[PDB]
Nucleic acid binder design. Structure first.
Length: 18
RNA sequence: GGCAGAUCUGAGCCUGGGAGCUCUCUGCC
């Protein structure tokens, strides 16, 4: 799946297989 | 060169509730 992180008030995600 | 983590309280942009990219810091090879 995608790994999210809180950046710029919004949550940025990173494609991670699952 | 690659990977991971962090954020307007490290920083910026686009879309539009996320998904990408660059930069910075840290760590690893």
């Amino acid at each position: 799946r995608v790994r999210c992180r809180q950046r710029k008030g919004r949550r940025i995600c990173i494609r991670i297989x699952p």
